[PDB]
Ligand binder design. Structure first.
Ligand SMILES: *Cc1[nH]c(/C=C2\NC(=O)C(CCC(=O)O)=C2CC(=O)O)c(CCC(=O)O)c1CC(=O)O
Length: 302
């Protein structure tokens, strides 16, 4: 019998995230060091199945989370580890998400065998990405490139497609390559001025049941409030815009050297021809940050 059953997707990256969580828990609570104390429960989700078409062409909520949320709500697992960018803006009834691990680098990596940067790609070169956020920002700056949207799969599947010449280049979160120790695949890193990240990129979230005080106490030892606050700001922005992984929206909150919250958000047309950016600054305090993301979102709306 385990003290903690951790639910996760079964890709190498999702297991990397679950093992980071295990390592951090063991350091604060040494009873979890024993093999037996922690059980990792690999759960298949619908997003693991529907891989043959672009993400913006797949309906429904919670493609990468629903089966894990159901395992948590019903007591099959005790905590659930997610990539925060894949968590719906509405949390499942009966669960809370009180913990984010320290955020990784939020920037996108450019992955290419022949060119160092987007600008070095020949006209007509094909960039694979199923993200409208990434497609819109690429085509805004590089209208002569072609984006292949039917570009899907786990990190290593996308790297395999690139090696097999299915596209000329792709983009991946630098966070995931770091967590997989596969950063030698990076050709260059895109700056925040070239590519604003998906809401909550680089953050791992951990959920538990609302009524589970034991788990909430373990998670309180892992939570990094500076990260959780930034993600709550970006998610307020996303929620206002009714955004998801299928919408061309980006947003990034962080704490500056004076201790304020600096937020930058954008919405773009999928063809890249129009982009609206907003930026806000304010205290690094939950209610102010959530209101800031909401206000920013309302101003991208009106
Ligand atoms: C929010 C968002 N999510 C995706 C795609 C994925 N989410 C995942 O959990 C995974 C699996 C990663 C793994 O190795 O475990 C994927 C990849 C998949 O095709 O299923 C995306 C699209 C990213 C893209 O195609 O560039 C987004 C949108 C975004 O803007 O990040």
């Amino acid at each position: 019998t385990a003290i903690i059953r951790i639910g996760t997707r079964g890709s190498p990256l999702a297991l990397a995230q679950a093992y980071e969580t295990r390592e951090k828990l063991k350091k604060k609570h040494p009873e979890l060091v024993e093999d037996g104390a922690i059980h990792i429960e690999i759960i298949k989700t619908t997003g693991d199945k529907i891989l043959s078409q672009p993400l913006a062409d797949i309906g429904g909520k919670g493609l990468f989370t629903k089966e894990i949320d159901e395992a948590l709500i019903n007591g099959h697992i005790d905590i659930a580890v997610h990539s925060m960018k894949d968590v719906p803006t509405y949390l499942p009834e009966k669960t809370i998400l009180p913990c984010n691990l320290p955020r990784e680098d939020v920037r996108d990596a450019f992955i290419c065998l022949t060119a160092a940067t987007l600008a070095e790609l020949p006209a007509g070169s094909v960039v694979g990405t199923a993200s409208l956020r990434r497609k819109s920002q690429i085509l805004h700056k590089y209208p002569a490139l072609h984006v292949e949207e039917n570009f899907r799969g786990n990190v290593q599947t996308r790297l395999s497609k690139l090696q097999g010449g299915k596209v000329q280049a792709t983009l991946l979160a630098l966070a995931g390559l770091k967590r997989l120790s596969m950063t030698e695949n990076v050709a260059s890193i895109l700056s925040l001025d070239e590519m604003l990240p998906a809401v909550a990129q680089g953050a791992i979230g951990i959920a538990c049941r609302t009524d589970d005080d034991k788990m909430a106490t373990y998670l309180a030892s892992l939570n990094h409030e500076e990260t959780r606050l930034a993600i709550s700001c970006e998610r307020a922005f996303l929620e206002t815009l009714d955004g998801s992984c299928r919408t061309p929206i980006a947003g990034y909150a962080s704490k500056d050297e004076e201790g304020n919250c600096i937020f930058r958000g954008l919405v773009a047309s999928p063809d890249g021809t129009k982009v609206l950016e907003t930026s806000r600054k304010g205290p690094y305090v939950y209610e102010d940050m959530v209101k800031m993301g909401k206000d920013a979102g309302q101003e991208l709306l009106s």
